[PDB]
Amino acid sequence: KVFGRCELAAAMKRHGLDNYRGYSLGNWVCAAKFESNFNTQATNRNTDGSTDYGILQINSRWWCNDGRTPGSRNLCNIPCSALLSSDITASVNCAKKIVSDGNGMNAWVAWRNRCKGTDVQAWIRGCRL
Ligand SMILES: [Cl-]
Ligand code: NA
Ligand SMILES: [Ru+3]
Ligand SMILES: [Ru+3]
Ligand SMILES: [Ru+3]
């Protein structure tokens, strides 16, 4: 599924992300935009052989199992494919674990480089929430 901006903001809010670990809703929407262009089916292979999955580009090195990242972990205890669903529940619950892990949203490089410090509330501007 390719979510609309407001559609995603609403879904993220329903799933508990608004101010999770102190991150306003617009931070989450901005990160999804630059990670996946709001496409739940987004995948990207990293040069270390790991792969990033779904709307928040969650990496198989640490977070999910894809059976093809030797030496990896599966800290969210899910198949990586779960992260590509139209239902964002798996992505959201995994993202909670990630952002709780010590470096906050800096875990998402595209957040640090494109969202951090910016007017992130613009991402939720005009949405019914
Ligand atoms: Cl933090
Ligand atoms: Na893994
Ligand atoms: Ru939902
Ligand atoms: Ru950890
Ligand atoms: Ru870790």
Curated annotation (Swiss-Prot):
GO molecular function: beta-N-acetylglucosaminidase activity; identical protein binding; lysozyme activity
Keywords: Allergen, Antimicrobial, Bacteriolytic enzyme, Disulfide bond, Glycosidase, Hydrolase, Secreted, Signal
CDD domains assigned to the protein according to its UniProt record, in alphabetical order: LYZ_C
One Gene Ontology term, aspect cellular component: endoplasmic reticulum
Compartments, record wording: Secreted
Domain C-type lysozyme as annotated: residue spans: 1-129
Tissues and organs where the protein is expressed, per its UniProt entry: In the egg white and polymorphonuclear leukocytes.
Positions of substrate binding: 101
Disulfide bonds: 6-127, 30-115, 64-80, 76-94
Transmembrane segments: none
Anything else known: Lysozyme C is capable of both hydrolysis and transglycosylation; it also shows a slight esterase activity. It acts rapidly on both peptide-substituted and unsubstituted peptidoglycan, and slowly on chitin oligosaccharides.
Family in the record: Belongs to the glycosyl hydrolase 22 family.
Name of the protein this chain belongs to: Lysozyme C
Organism expressing this protein natively: Gallus gallus
